[model samples]
Target: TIYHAKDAVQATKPDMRKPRLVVFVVGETARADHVSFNGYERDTFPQLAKIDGVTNFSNVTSCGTSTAYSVPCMFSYLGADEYDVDTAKYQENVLDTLDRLGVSILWRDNNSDSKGVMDKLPKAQFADYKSATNNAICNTNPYNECRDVGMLVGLDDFVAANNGKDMLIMLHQMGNHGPAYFKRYDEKFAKFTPVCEGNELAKCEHQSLINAYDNALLATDDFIAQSIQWLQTHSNAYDVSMLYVSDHGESLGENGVYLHGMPNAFAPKEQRSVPAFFWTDKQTGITPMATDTVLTHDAITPTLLKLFDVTADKVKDRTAFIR
Candidate 1:
């Protein structure tokens, strides 16, 4: 029940266009139903919605329902439908393949758990700037709570330093992952009023809880927009492309489900469905999707690799994006 695994499947990639860059934005606990981009009632994706080249993935199901399972599996070659924990752990992955090809990959994470995905990759991260709520656009927060926006700090400088090479930069965001969803964003993103200010979600009113979650979603939206704007400003420096996919989703007290990690067989749609999107300066062969079709984490690897004009043998049906 696996698509493919490491040391078993081999890919041949010739030298892609030099100075091409792809930014893979990994999100945590973001469900599709809440995103306005997917037609939610609220304007959760206000800024991301405005980006011209962006494509919203409406019908998406995650590989797993928890960070532990989803984060690692999202990057595995076995990927979506055929994923399993123990088996995936023993397999090598796309990152390993990319690193070996001299692609100059850098992983910057705001989430404490890399889920071992970054074990064999180069990274750009800081020691002091840490938290699930520190949302200074560039991480120069006067206070702590190291926010997702903090992950963007000095990002352009990083790409500039590694200029003149094909690059894959992954930004792992501390998304609407929760129990403490209120702390996920700052005052500016608190568009919804009278949010649940308490840590005990069950004790709060349902509306407040939803409000808090939506705020966190907006915060992620801001982080995304800021990132795109930065890339636009620096477009001359690199042939830039961007993709945003959540590792898994969260439940907002729907039928008594609070957070994620639910067993797949009995899990609600809110726990399994996710919001994903893609953006690029120009056509790179990846389509602007959303055909009322169902996509999952597995689709990511092929689209990602193709950005570099790279492909593996017999990799068809492994990804949703076909050239």
Candidate 2:
């Protein structure tokens, strides 16, 4: 059931006479409804809102309700309805697809729940940014204490030392993943008067949890903004294009579900709806159409290739550019 990208002859290598890079910042457990860009009442995405060249897709959805399904599904050739869990048990992945076609890849991880997705790629060098928690390995820090604001903290030096080459770098954010609301934000960003001290989503009041989540979103915005600025300032190697997508949405006490991992059939919109944004600088002359087309996690593979002007012969159930 594993789907792979079409093996089309490489279109002329993108006219990389100019330097170019694509950065994909994938968030964990973020539901679109909670993000301001998708109409959340709180200003959770003030930074994202201000990015001039960014195209925000308001109606994007994930194929599954949990990371196990969503992550592989998004990276595999399979569409949402055709995800091959068994094939994933033994298969090549997006990195394989890109590598076979001569594209370089790198993955940066901040959380423990990244195995299945990381399995398909070359070993990602791990960075220890976990906060001191009972489950420190699994606990994601909201302020990114464990994970630095710049995902390129150590990697940037590596990229600089090596000649800048066409590459795909994945920055997986710990993000507003939780029951650990208090852990995700600083006291200054705490908007809700009564904060929830508990980490279990079911035990705390929904509003209080959301307030904490919003703060984490704010942190994420800052992280991304800084990453973009860095690329513009430091890298003259490649035309930089950036995109962010959540693995899956979460349920903050919606219906009785506390978090993700539920079956897709019972998952609420809060658990399926996801946020996706893409931005490329005007200088690159590669403009992604700005459209409100309904996109799903399954489209990630083809979209990446398309952005690089790599024409694959057989993109499975791929959706064309929307604008």
Candidate 3:
């Protein structure tokens, strides 16, 4: 037995916009303080920096310090304050609401898992590198983890299969996933010297550990750019857009804190601050967010609904960050 929202979500205006494709990325363990666009000293996100029409929302906070606690909350109507894993598992999330509105939803995860956010959906809607272990793209790095780019395979066909329909493709990245940060990216992105090479992060020099983390950011930046390019290729068929937000930030040995998942009550800013940005080929009614504009994971669901001119009677006390 399953439970969808009591108040059905309906598109305020049917076909209000053209068929659109939005890539909503769930980034892993990346911090705003390390991002180049957010005034970091390092040029970590080089590829994204080169893209025009990209709006970097510099001041964004995450709901939780860990993916297990945050991913579902990010997709649910229950904002951070009221979120519970058990409750979220039964409730229909934004994806379900959008699916009811006829949007094609695909969730491709490279991180550990979706954390039960899409549990109620059909299994076909989800894809991960583990299922396709034989694919050359999976388990290529020293840590034997699948690269985030591996999820991009066959995306062109996914879009074509849903012809004339609006689509939402959620790409969950392994971006800078902790401890073994050096294994997250390819050697080409190791532009920073004196790198950290082990899982014991505390053993490495502070600067070297930061270098490894920044290299992963470079890879994530490239992955987002590649995803954008894929959407651009199909722009004529669909109004293309991309929005990326990290599930939570990482702490790189600040005040004896090494990794994330500190309690929310006392979690440092490094664990709460997240990086977010938006890109679109067309004007999407979203107002440009100022660099210092405060926002949080709660806005994601609303912004998505706004993009499709949709709303739900049960969704309350929420405002779209974009508008």
Candidate 4:
């Protein structure tokens, strides 16, 4: 839809069953094969494996192969089939529509890019989530880039400052985004030995690199579990739900390719197959999907709309249903 930037907002209200409190987490790069719930042998999701009420989507394809494309495409009306940079630029996706519907939307991010997703929102709407004493950084300083824990602080801040209205908090992580996966997590999380210590991926053995990547994935697992634990602690006041999906996935030394971004058609399966995990305070049909299904990213907006019980007006071709 060519958003006139006017009043597409209407009386799309929530049902009496629940008040919305959504924590939509856009995880950094993570592959479905690296997830434990997806039946991988390694314990990548150490914390999430034991956490109850978690719904794991083992088969979710990225709209684009990288964040430059995936981030906007995921939130836009355009699914992968019709996605393009120029068209996605001017579209009003779920977040904007949500904002127009009088819902409070906050974006706390550690990654440098929102891919102009926040452009539709008011200025000063997004916060830069960073750690104070933590030393995991890809750049200079005591910590140039913070670990995922920093976002937890922002989450707490939002929870504390939140009034008695509905809220949607989006937290973006820096998961498994390498050439610097070794710097993503804490030193204690470096469980895999003889791992690749440098960005020159071609210089290390494939298994050693996998070890490093898995360790990063482990940190993501813990981050997500910790976030869920926080939500559970606060479930008395409002109905809390969380949705986590990676911007895209990575290619770990597969088919002679080292990193991601190989275009959608020619990209390896590892790059397209990412994880979309969900957890809610109450049980809904969304807790599980069919045994055999792979969802694309455009469904995200409509799913959120449906979760909030607002379906009066929606963009074209967003007919995805997790239930």
Candidate 5:
């Protein structure tokens, strides 16, 4: 069911049947309200806003406050409500489910703290392989050491090499995952000025941080746009469907909380609300649907399986398949 690139290529050759490619781009510490598509004052997601087949969900929420719990909780068999720290520590995740069902999973992380999801998946391809690169940023420190573009750079070759084969590629962005928002983007994207240089989330002015964060969002939007375009043009081997979701939202000085990881109950909308978007080619047979019911990361795996027409008897509870 699970095979490496060499074996997969050899086995699937001559016939070369096109497979479904699922790209899951995950943002870190991003609040949905700050995004332009969500009606923020700034045009942070210009590229994403224009994505032709993209579906933007207006009212999605995160099940947890921090990446440690939230990321795994989202990817696990357990739904958000049932996902506890203890349970996640011993859980078999989405990758396991996929592997058992013959799906190929690849994880390309820009965030150092990847919540061990990559490890749980059998034959999971890790793009940023070197320990030096993996540990470029200290896990505990609030530093803008890792670049969000790093994930793209790492996966560029893998994506190129693996044209198809039912891939579940996870691109975890270091987007707006910051204290040093100024470092997240370049000068051209810098719209809000007279920005505060301080990394301390609470001490820094709200507007300044928002500006910096917005800049990063712009960068992220560009990344998604380019990636989708590349997939559409470069490979005829798969029906590509790209979906983006944040692990959890960030707090930019709201309620005196600077970054993520306040208790779930105390977490505000700014720390829980996140953007979810999907883009697909018409040939994929997936359609966008509008709904008022709430959605979260916990719905991702089930939705993906349903999208691919993969059969599973029991789905994750609290999970829904969006059209």
Candidate 6:
């Protein structure tokens, strides 16, 4: 079969009393070190930190150093070690498996785009950063970007419409996507002071640049935490959960590097290490396994399949999913 997920299928769990609804957040340029749960001294992610049962996995390595590569690579059945962009284009990935298994999938992107990961998916929506007519949280500034909160505009409505069907919603965030880190968030999140004010990253002081980056994470913290609340609001209609992972990490003036997309070989950990987190309601029958095991993006596809009680031959990575 041309598709690696050709035989991938889901078997509904008799134990599940309601259909499952999951929010898969794909973050951009969010390195693990800045997250408080990952041992960062600064409480950058205070919002998520307050939430109970949120597991922030440590020692998680990304599939690639850029969003273009990592997003599709994580979803592909081929592990990062063997992932070839050209080869993956013609073959279906895990999303296709979930689609065929009757899982209602939605991809809402606030970033530049999905980088071709949602190319053939049925319900992929891009936020209109230029106007706020549809997305109320957009175009608040001249940066031509929308706040992450805008992605949740009609989410509840979508879930309500798809009631009783297993669902997956991917929120592709513009989270901390760099050189203009200061622009990624609002003034309220400026908890860290003396931020780098412009896209000219090289001109900024190292501490100032890190301050801007951490502030952006604060916005991510609020976005993800609020999304969890939204899922909980509708938990009666579906067994809700949220899984978050970044496409790649960022370099904040480390050595001479100031941004992401460094080659995997010899790349600094700042560019390849990303944060992975999971949160679920009490009814989902899912519990996070606490182990200091190092994980990689390759585990995402298999773990996602397993979350929905699906199976695929290319499954790999002993992930965080457990009852």
- Model 2: CA > 4 A from native: 1-6, 14-16, 124-145, 148-150, 234-236, 320-323
Regions of candidate 3 where Cα sits further than 4 Å from its true position: 1-9, 12-17, 130-136, 139-144, 283-285
The Cα error of candidate 6 at residue 117, in Å, is: 1.4
Q: How many backbone overlaps does candidate 3 show? A: 0
TM-score of each: 0.88, 0.86, 0.93, 0.89, 0.84, 0.93
The deviation in Å at residue 136 for candidate 1 is: 7.4
lDDT of the candidates, in the order given = 0.74, 0.68, 0.82, 0.75, 0.68, 0.80
**Residue 218 CA displacement from its true place in model 1, Å:** 0.7
Measured with C-alpha atoms, the lDDT of residue 225 in candidate 4 is: 89
Ranking by TM-score: 6, 3, 4, 1, 2, 5
Query: Which tens-of-lDDT digit does each residue in 218-269 have in candidate 2?
Result: 7777777777776676445567888788988887776687778788886678
Model 6 lowest lDDT segment of ten: 122-131
Residues 1-323 of candidate 4 have per-residue lDDT tens digits of 56632444333344434456788889778998888789888888888878777888867888877878889887876566766777776787778877877778888777765788888788667876654442234343234567776676645566667655567888888888888777777767888876887879978888889899999898898889888887887677667888898988888887778778878878888888889888877643354455346687867876776666566344434555355
**Clashing residue pairs, candidate 1?**
134-145, 134-146, 134-147
lDDT of 1 by residue, 1-323 (tens): 23242333323332434367778888988889898867789989889878888878788888889888887787777756666776765566767666655677777677765777776454443222354433344433334467776767777677777767777878888788788888788888889988997877878999999999999999999988887887787577567788898988888887877888888888888887898878888634456555456788887777766676656653445655334
Per-residue lDDT over 193-257 for candidate 5, one digit per residue giving the tens place of the 0 to 100 score: 76667756667767777777777777777778877876686446677888888888887776676
Question: Please, what's the RMSD in Å of model 4?
Answer: 3.3
Inter-residue clash pairs, candidate 6: none
* Consecutive 10-residue window with the lowest summed lDDT within model 1: 1-10
Worst 10 residues of 3 by lDDT: 5-14
